[PDB]
C-alpha cells in the first residue's frame, strides 16, 4: 500500500493495489491423435516442380507436421515468414496448408513476398497482401540449370491486367500490343506471352534460380487436420490450467458443458466474440471454458499513525479459492474480525460492510 | 566485439534478425545501440584450400541469449538414443567449419 501511493505515510481508507489471480498448475495439450507423418518432405523433395506461370499446388491435410526440420535446416538461403515465426510454428495447428511450388529467378526472390511488384509478382504469381506463410527458398542453381539453358520453366512476361491473388493463368493466347489486330499468329506485335528464360551454371546471382515453396498456412476457423508435432496430455477438469485445444490456447478452468453443439461445430464464442467453449479434438466432449478465478485486491488499513496491522479484501473471490476469514457478498475479507456490533461506516468494504480500527481491525 | 561472418549472413548481425549465426553463434540485443561495421574480408581470411579456423555453431539446444558466448564442445544428440558422447549416427561436433 505504501508503494502504491508513493509515500511512507498512508491515510485511513481503502486502496486498490494489486490483482489476485490463481495461477495455472498444468499444461493441457489436446490434438487429434493422427500420427501419420505429414508429407511436407515430398513438396520440398519433389524432383520436378512447376514453372512460375503454372505454379504447382499440393493441399496437405490429415497429418501431423513437424516444423523443426524446416527451421533446423542449414541449407535454405531464404526462410522469410510473414504472419508467423518458424520457431513457434510447432505450437499451433492449422486448418489447411497449401504448398505452392515453382522455380523463380534469384533477383526476383524479393518479389515473392507480400505486397511486392515486378513481372513475377504481377503476371505470374501474386502473394496475397495479408499472407500468412513462409517463403522458403534455396539456391537451386545446380539442379535446375543446364549448360545449354533450361527452357522448361516459363514466366508470363506480359498480361492484360495484373494477376489476382492466388490465381493461376494457363492462357496461351497471343498478346497484341498494337492497334492492329495482331491476327492470332506471330508477327509484329504478336508473340507468345510466356518468355522462356535461360540459365547456365555460371550465371550471376541475379540470374541464378531460386526455387520456392511458399507454405500458405490457413488459419480460418474450422476443423484442423494439419498439426504440430506436440504431444498431448490428459484432460484435467475443474482446475485452473493452461490449455491448448487444436491450436486454441489460453488459461482457464475447463468444466462439463450442457451446450448442444452441432456435429460440425468445433468451438464456441461468447457475446463478446471471445472463445468460451471447445470441443476436445480426441473425445467429442463439449467443454465450457471459464477464466481462472481473479479479482481486485484492496488493502483495508488504519493509517500509519495508528497501526501497521492490515486486512486484505479479495474482491469477488470466494474464501475457498484464496489459498480471521470473513466471507461477504463483496468478496473474501481476511485480517478483519467480524463482529455482531454495528457502528458508523469508517473504511468501506462493500455490500453494506464497513471496517474500522478499534486495538484491532474489525469488519 | 570482433568476428568473421559469411557474406549472406551479414544481414543477420543486425537487431532482431534470425538465422544460424544470429540464433546459435552471436545474437545482437533487440535494443542495440551500436554500429555494425563490415568489410569484404575475402582476400585476407580466405585461402585457396579453405580456412577452417573460423567455426560457427550450427545446432544448439536453445537460442543464444543476447551477448552470451558459448564455448561448449559437447556432442549434440539429435535422436532419442543417447548418442553416447563420441561420434556416430546423431553424434557430431556442434561447430561445423565452413570453407
Amino acid at each position, epitope marked *: 500500500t505504501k508503494c502504491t501511493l508513493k509515500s511512507f505515510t498512508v491515510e485511513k481508507g481503502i486502496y486498490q493495489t494489486s490483482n489476485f489471480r490463481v495461477q495455472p498448475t498444468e499444461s493441457i495439450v489436446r490434438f487429434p491423435n493422427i500420427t501419420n507423418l505429414c508429407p511436407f518432405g515430398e513438396v*520440398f523433395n519433389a524432383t520436378r516442380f512447376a514453372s512460375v506461370y503454372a505454379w504447382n499446388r499440393k493441399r496437405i491435410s490429415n497429418c501431423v507436421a513437424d516444423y523443426s526440420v524446416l527451421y533446423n535446416s542449414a541449407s535454405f538461403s531464404t526462410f522469410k515468414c510473414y504472419g508467423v515465426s518458424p520457431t513457434k510454428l510447432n505450437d499451433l495447428c492449422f486448418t489447411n496448408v497449401y504448398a505452392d511450388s515453382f522455380v523463380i529467378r534469384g533477383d526476383e526472390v524479393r518479389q515473392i513476398a507480400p505486397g511486392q511488384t515486378g513481372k513475377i509478382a504481377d503476371y505470374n504469381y501474386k502473394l496475397p497482401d495479408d499472407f500468412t506463410g513462409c517463403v522458403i527458398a534455396w539456391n537451386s542453381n545446380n*539442379l535446375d540449370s543446364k549448360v545449354g539453358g533450361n527452357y522448361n520453366y516459363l514466366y508470363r512476361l506480359f498480361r492484360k491486367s495484373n494477376l489476382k491473388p492466388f490465381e493461376r493463368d494457363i492462357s496461351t493466347e497471343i498478346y497484341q500490343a498494337g492497334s492492329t489486330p495482331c491476327n492470332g499468329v506471330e508477327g509484329f506485335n504478336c508473340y507468345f506471352p510466356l518468355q522462356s528464360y535461360g540459365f547456365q*551454371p555460371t550465371n550471376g546471382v541475379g540470374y541464378q534460380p531460386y526455387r520456392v515453396v511458399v507454405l500458405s498456412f490457413e488459419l480460418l476457423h474450422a476443423p484442423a487436420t494439419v498439426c504440430g508435432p506436440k504431444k498431448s496430455t490428459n484432460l484435467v477438469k475443474n482446475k485452473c490450467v493452461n490449455f491448448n485445444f487444436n491450436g486454441l490456447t489460453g488459461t482457464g478452468v475447463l468444466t462439463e458443458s450442457n451446450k448442444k453443439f452441432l456435429p460440425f461445430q468445433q468451438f464456441g464464442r461468447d457475446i463478446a466474440d471471445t472463445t468460451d467453449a471447445v470441443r476436445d479434438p480426441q473425445t467429442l466432449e463439449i467443454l465450457d471454458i471459464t477464466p481462472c478465478s481473479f479479482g481486485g485486491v484492496s488493502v483495508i488499513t488504519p493509517g500509519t499513525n495508528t497501526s501497521n496491522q492490515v486486512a486484505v479484501l479479495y474482491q469477488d473471490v470466494n474464501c475457498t479459492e484464496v489459498p480471521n476469514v470473513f466471507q461477504t457478498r463483496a468478496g473474501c475479507l481476511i485480517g478483519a474480525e467480524h463482529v455482531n456490533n454495528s457502528y458508523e461506516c469508517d473504511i468501506p468494504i462493500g455490500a453494506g460492510i464497513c471496517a474500522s480500527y478499534q486495538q484491532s481491525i474489525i469488519a | 566485439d570482433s568476428f568473421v561472418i559469411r557474406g549472406d549472413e551479414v544481414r543477420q548481425i543486425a537487431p532482431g534478425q534470425t538465422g544460424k549465426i544470429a540464433d546459435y553463434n552471436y545474437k545482437l540485443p533487440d535494443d542495440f545501440t551500436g554500429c555494425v561495421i563490415a568489410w569484404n574480408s575475402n582476400n585476407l581470411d580466405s585461402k585457396v*584450400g579453405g580456412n577452417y579456423n573460423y567455426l560457427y555453431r550450427l545446432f544448439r539446444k536453445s537460442n543464444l541469449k543476447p551477448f552470451e558466448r558459448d564455448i561448449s564442445t559437447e556432442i549434440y544428440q539429435a535422436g532419442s538414443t543417447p548418442c553416447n558422447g563420441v561420434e556416430g549416427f546423431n553424434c557430431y561436433f556442434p561447430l561445423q567449419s565452413y570453407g
Partner: antibody
Amino acid sequence: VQLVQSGAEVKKPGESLKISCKGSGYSFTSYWIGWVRQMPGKGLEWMGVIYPGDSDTRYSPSFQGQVTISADKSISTAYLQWSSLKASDTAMYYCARTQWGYNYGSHFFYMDVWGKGTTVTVS
Amino acid sequence: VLTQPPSASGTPGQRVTISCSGSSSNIGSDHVYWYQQLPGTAPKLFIYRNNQRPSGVPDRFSGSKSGTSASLAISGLRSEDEADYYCAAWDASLSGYVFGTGTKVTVL
C-alpha cells in the same frame, strides 16, 4: 524395383547401337533414369540423365555430344543411343534410377537402384 | 575429381579407414556417398547424406566428412568386403557426378 536393362552387344566401329533400360515395379514415368559408364576394372564415370516424363536430358562434360540419350515413357523404357560407335567406347554400361530432391535444401543425387549393366564390346 | 588410395588392406576383425580427397567445389556441399562394387555385381546405395545408412545395409559401416575429404570406416572387417569402395560426389563446376578412383580392399 528390378530395372531389366538389356543383354550384351558386340559391334564394329561406326555403326549405330541402342541400349534399352526397361523399368518395372515402380512409377517409371516420374523418376530420373540416369546412366553411368564403367570401363573394365576402372572407376565408375557418370554419363547423364533422362527424365522419361519430360524427355529432359543432362550430360557430363566428357559425354555431351558424344552420346545421345533419349526415353520412351509409353513403354516405360529409357534409351541410351550412340550417334557413332567408337573404339574406346567398350565398357560395362549401367542404368540406375536417380532422384534429385532437395531434402529441405540439401541437394542429393544417389543412384538408389542399379540394373545388371550392358557389356558392350567394340572391335 | 575425387582422389582415393589405390588399395587398402588389413586383418579381419580390425577397423579400416579409407580416405577420399577433394576440393571445395565438390565436397563443400553434403556429398559423401558410398557404394561398393563386389565382383560381378552392381553398386547400390550404401551410405548417404555423409553418414546416413539405408535400411537393408550392415550396421558396421560408418563414414564421415573431414573438411573437403571423405572418410569411410569399416569396423570389424569380414571376408565378403572385397568390394570396390566408391566415394562419390558431384563437382558442381559443369555439374556432373564424379566417383573417386576406387579402392580395392584386400583381406589378410
